[PDB]
Symmetry: C4
Subunit: 389 residues, 4 copies
């Protein structure tokens, strides 16, 4: 598309105006050689209102410039040529519609302050006696004074000497030295929001760890609490899927979930090739859970019935005691299905070989699934009746 | 009413005192020509206590001024004429009872600091040797010094030279340079609360978008999540009606709801002209929901029964498959009524042609409505039995 | 008690040390006339460890002073007499155990900074060439420089001139100019917590009012929403009783409730003189609710049964229509009792004459009360059977 | 282990580089005697990439130094030797993996600013005319100027005099005087998080106390609310066990609970020596509760059945009236067991002699325990039948 190119070009034109117009207000020797480079940017300003896809555009586009300097209008009225700076109040919002915004906003404030400093320096250069000095060093001194005043440092090596300069510096010391604190506060607060996810996984971890270390916790447990937390930050960046997705409506949430959980989908044998309405009914009820190594899930005799679907990692099935391990299950399989099918207590124990994450599904949705969909229930039936040895 | 006029006049009088009294304390040549303009404001100060609809008013109204300058009381005791400044401590609270308060408060703090600066400058002008200089430039220099000190810039071009001036500037450098930081912090924090609604629709959108862009989401879904969010900001400003209205009591909430949801009311045929107690029983249970274009609502076979009332936009009804579209529904109509009436599963599918918002009503309130109100149930009965083709 | 007197005396002694010890470190001409006033404060320092009802006390109490100046120990080692300042690190915490703490903390930080400024000024006075000047003006100049540096104003009229002074001022410009910002930030944040209740009733009111004024709400409703809110702030200061009292345990909550709701207690005829276990069972289930004038409570035909106990204000009972008003009820009475007793729908309508607040009690606790306590049920029975006309 | 030693050594080497490299950039007379101390640190830099258990390490380890000064490369290109400072951007994160982090982070920011100040001072020393002055005082003056500028104090005693110096000081006054505010804000905010637990027990206590003191609460109740709160802070530091432990998964939560509640375990006679599956089923359902002295728990006639296990303190059993105290129970015992066993109302009253904390267990888990485990039910049966006198 070319809308990005046009927006970048408009930004370039409105920065050209911002840098140029006060500087040519101070020095009238310009605008004679820079004339050909101004008509193009002026006709590229009235051609932006038709490209709607608004009062700033109406006021700023009309060529109020190029005549103020033409008729050589005197000084108390020549300040009305400054209205071509009103594109910024819209550009700062239109540039947002393109990169993390917490980054685009951070930069826009920085340019703004470097434009305000230039404008104030050009203002201070004007109301001075005519001194036979080069223009470049005069601008350097004016900008040095403006940065000294705005930062509330105040060296005092160069200070006002006339009542007009005194009033001007009072106005600056109030206004600019207030917005510098304001903009620096905003930027300082918004730098701390570049991370967002790192901060919460750290606040949560510190909150848990302070309480754990306050008590006389053995080193072993304290080893695992910090390993799980690191695993969660690595694989999920501290995000909470549920907590994010209860802001969206139901169809958008379903569409997002069917792509987010698309890894466990087409992995287990019994989901793919089993219709498209079952896969929509069951996708929202799959919830993630993490079990670390050397940790138990089923303890062979408990109530409840919660099928567990292996996403990543290997799970090991054991008896009610340590003896006679049956087998080992891997990625894309599941276990714990006959607790509700046969109406019997748990008949085996399961551990985790490594950091394996897996999806747990409740009993109510599961027995509703059995009561509604016959052939999937039959497949579970034959798998359970075969799994008897 | 004239209470606004009287309050504005009292504000004008208490600003006249604030600007004048220290300035006439410094210069005793005044108060001779300004006498006729003082008696009116003094008699407009004792006439405010009777207009109650209070200790500041009691202390400040009594003409302690106009005698201090009369008897020409000496300097160490003449400072007791400053008590006419105690109207501000009430005026700053009484002006609130009139425009967003987050705007009225922002301005009141700005005037306060420009009054404190003037008072401090008038103070610094006093304890100086008598210099043969014009009064205007002397006030300008004093105000320049006060603004330099309060802003913590400190050029140092004009500095104290006597022990009394040194003690005065120590007092200012502590006290005023503390409240300047305090007031600027308050104003900086309260500028960010002018928006309120824009901020939350932006924090929520960034929170969702960061997680969406962290994953490998296709561009299509990412297109719709941001279109819905923009539609919600345009039509609701990011507000949450439920979340706002669970602070009010039940009768106030009902009265607010019957005006807020008054658009869907008198629009559908079966609500207006159907009593006034049904319309009170059902107004609180209507909840809004948004469905975007190309999105499904009913999938022809599901459980549940939730009638959907069309507020704005057109909804299209389809079969269990793509073939044989029945008809199209428009603004002010509804669908999905016979799921509970006939005790049958959903017999049709519905999509959205554009961004249509609609109101969903639960099954419990609906069957209670059927069990309580006979004639509305009969109207639904005849509409359902006619809608069989 | 005398513990307050002893604590105030200890504060006076530890402020005497704080003001005196660096000042006598700078000027060795003292400590000769001030000797009798030091032994008393020194023996009032070793007598505080026995009054336990602790390392700061152990280190600071031992008379390390009074010998440093005695043997006239040289300068590089005389700084070890400063350890008598270590009582402050405990006093700042012990003074809390006495007035809103948000006020006591605000003042303690202010004294701390005025002690740090004095200590730094006394430090700067020392490493100077011997100048034949009065001591008072020298201290004034040193304190002026210290306040200029700590506030980050920096006039620059008096500046370091020796390498030792340069190192000292670098140390101050880092350390003191950091804690001044720190302490001022703390004080600025904690000034805004003096109110606490005013802020929340204002944030809530603005949050509701912004949404109400965004919509096209009639002036009448907007009149009542703001009157109720003002009534709630006047009678409850914006507090939420429930929200406060679910931090306490059950017995403390019961003890607090039996005193808070003691106004409605011994007011209605049927509670006082009706045992002490019923009054404990029912005190926690009474909840407050506010109904404004011209507002309805019962609409004659609804389901539910919620007895309403009149706390303050008059309530008016009406028929199902406007005609034939029955009577008027006043403070200390109740209504709406036979909805559950006779198993009949509501037979009357009730309005509010003015801003009357009243207590609502649910149906489950009420019918449990009827099922458990016989004589109160009999009293309700006879009152209901008499109230048939 | 030796990984801590290696990490400390790497920190020492990267601080040696940070202090040395700009200082030898300014003064070329060095690097001749300091050569033997550089080769060791350079070969201790390429030996860190193999010890992985990464682009900063790749760029910084290659000996780009030691040749820039060798060939005596000119000034506009000699600045490329600064790349050996890129270890800090990793070291600041790797030092975290070792002491409360809220302390390690506080210190890392302080070193960073003292390194930035040194770098800026060394920069300012360079672009100066050659003055016949000692190097030490020149560095002292440069560092004094850098600290004056970064702190936004600005004495102005020494100021730039050349255009290059003016551009340099503009760059510093923007950049360094922005990050000084940023880092000081971060450190000021993070100092207030060293406590964490103290703050919440204080915010909660103030929130409760403001409401209690707003009402006309008697002094007696106000005495106990503050004693319980102090007891809770002493024995639990204001922590909420439940609220912390609903962030961990179920097996980690169980493992943590079986160590946290290990005090009440092996204390009561009937838990230890009663299997290992009962002790896992019941450990998560024990919840703590605190009852102060002179407070009632059971009032002899109520419904419900909640066994109470004595952790610490003595509990006293009384009749339905004051007469005929039966006995006294101590640490490690329990009461209130026959409310569900005999299906009878409460037959006794119990008070608290002192601040005794105890564990309450609900009725559903208790009757499930009775229905599942026979021998523990039999032990409760025989204890209840013996406890009949
Ligand atoms: C980045 C760095 C700053 C921007 C780039 C460098 C800016 C230009 C720097 C520059 O050349 O300095 C002077 C500019 O003079 C002139 O009229 C130029 C006057 C305007 C210069 C720019 C002023 C604003 C700088 C705002 C910086 C913001 C940074 C964030 C010229 O003297 P020069 O060095 O030849 O020595 C002369 C003699 O002393 C030794 O031979
Ligand atoms: C807005 C702008 C400031 C307020 C409006 C302008 C204020 C007045 C500005 C003004 O006229 O300046 C001087 C005031 O003198 C006098 O005695 C007047 C002394 C008091 C002036 C006001 C001081 C406080 C300003 C606080 C501003 C806060 C802004 C936020 C007079 O010299 P003038 O220019 O004739 O040149 C003389 C010669 O140098 C060239 O012919
Ligand atoms: C409150 C106000 C400040 C405290 C109270 C007033 C403090 C004392 C004020 C004082 O008397 O000033 C000088 C103190 O001199 C001396 O040696 C005294 C030196 C020490 C004075 C105190 C310094 C610290 C003040 C910290 C204030 C914090 C406020 C928050 C003496 O000159 P004096 O006036 O006779 O004129 C002389 C000539 O110029 C005209 O006859
Ligand atoms: C802690 C304190 C500061 C660090 C420790 C002390 C630092 C060194 C202090 C020092 O000795 O000062 C001068 C350093 O000179 C030199 O070249 C040394 C130049 C560099 C000194 C260090 C500068 C940065 C200090 C950054 C401090 C951050 C604190 C947080 C020497 O003059 P000296 O006293 O012999 O008197 C001479 C005459 O006036 C009287 O006989
Ligand atoms: N021999 C086996 N081979 C494969 N899977 C098994 C075997 N024995 C038990 N399982 C699985 O392990 C599960 C443990 O709990 P369930 O009894 O609910 O259901 C069990 C089966 O899913
Ligand atoms: N031919 C039709 N004309 C109008 N509305 C229909 C038609 N067919 C179905 N509907 C509506 O579409 C709804 C789809 O779900 P229900 O079966 O619950 O109820 C259905 C009717 O409200
Ligand atoms: N004539 C009356 N005198 C006093 N109270 C009444 C009278 N009529 C109705 N009430 C009360 O008003 C209540 C309205 O609702 P209820 O019918 O639940 O119970 C009613 C009584 O408590
Ligand atoms: N004489 C006694 N000796 C020991 N314990 C008792 C005695 N009488 C009552 N209790 C205990 O006190 C409890 C009070 O409530 P319960 O009746 O539920 O169960 C009671 C017993 O656990």
């Amino acid at each position: 598309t070319y809308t990005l190119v046009w927006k970048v070009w408009i930004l370039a034109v409105t920065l050209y105006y911002a840098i140029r117009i006060p500087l040519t207000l101070v020095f009238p020797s310009l605008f004679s050689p820079l004339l050909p480079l101004d008509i193009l940017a002026s006709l590229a300003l009235i051609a932006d209102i038709p490209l709607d896809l608004r009062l700033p555009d109406l006021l700023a586009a009309l060529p109020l410039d190029l005549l103020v300097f033409a008729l050589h209008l005197p000084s108390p009225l020549s300040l009305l040529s400054l209205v071509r700076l009103l594109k910024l109040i819209s550009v700062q919002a239109s540039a947002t519609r393109i990169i993390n915004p917490a980054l685009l906003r951070l930069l826009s404030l920085v340019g703004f302050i470097l434009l305000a400093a230039h404008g104030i320096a050009c203002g201070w250069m004007s109301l001075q006696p005519p001194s036979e000095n080069p223009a470049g060093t005069r601008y350097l001194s004016a900008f040095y004074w403006t940065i000294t005043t705005l930062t509330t440092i105040g060296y005092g090596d160069i200070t006002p000497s006339t009542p007009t300069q005194t009033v001007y510096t009072i106005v600056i010391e109030l206004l600019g030295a207030a917005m510098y604190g304001l903009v620096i506060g905003n930027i300082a607060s918004l730098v701390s929001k570049l991370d967002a996810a790192k901060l919460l996984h750290r606040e949560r971890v510190e909150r848990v760890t302070a309480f754990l270390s306050y008590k006389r916790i053995s080193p072993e447990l304290q080893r695992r609490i910090i390993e799980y937390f690191d695993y969660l930050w690595e694989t999920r960046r501290g995000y909470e899927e549920r907590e994010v997705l209860k802001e969206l409506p139901h169809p958008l949430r379903l569409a997002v979930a069917m792509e987010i959980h698309g890894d466990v989908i087409e992995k287990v044998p019994l989901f793919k090739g089993a219709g498209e309405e079952f896969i929509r009914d069951i996708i929202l009820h799959l919830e993630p859970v993490i079990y670390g190594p050397g940790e138990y899930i089923i303890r062979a005799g408990e109530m409840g019935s919660d099928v567990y679907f292996i996403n990543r990692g290997s799970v090991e099935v054991l008896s009610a005691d340590e003896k006679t391990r049956y087998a080992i299950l891997s990625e894309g399989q599941f276990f714990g299905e006959m607790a509700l099918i046969l109406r019997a207590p748990r008949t085996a124990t399961v551990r985790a070989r490594a950091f394996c994450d897996l999806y747990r599904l409740d009993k109510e949705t599961f027995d509703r699934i059995l009561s509604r969909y016959p052939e999937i229930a039959a497949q579970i039936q034959e798998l359970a009746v075969r799994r008897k040895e």
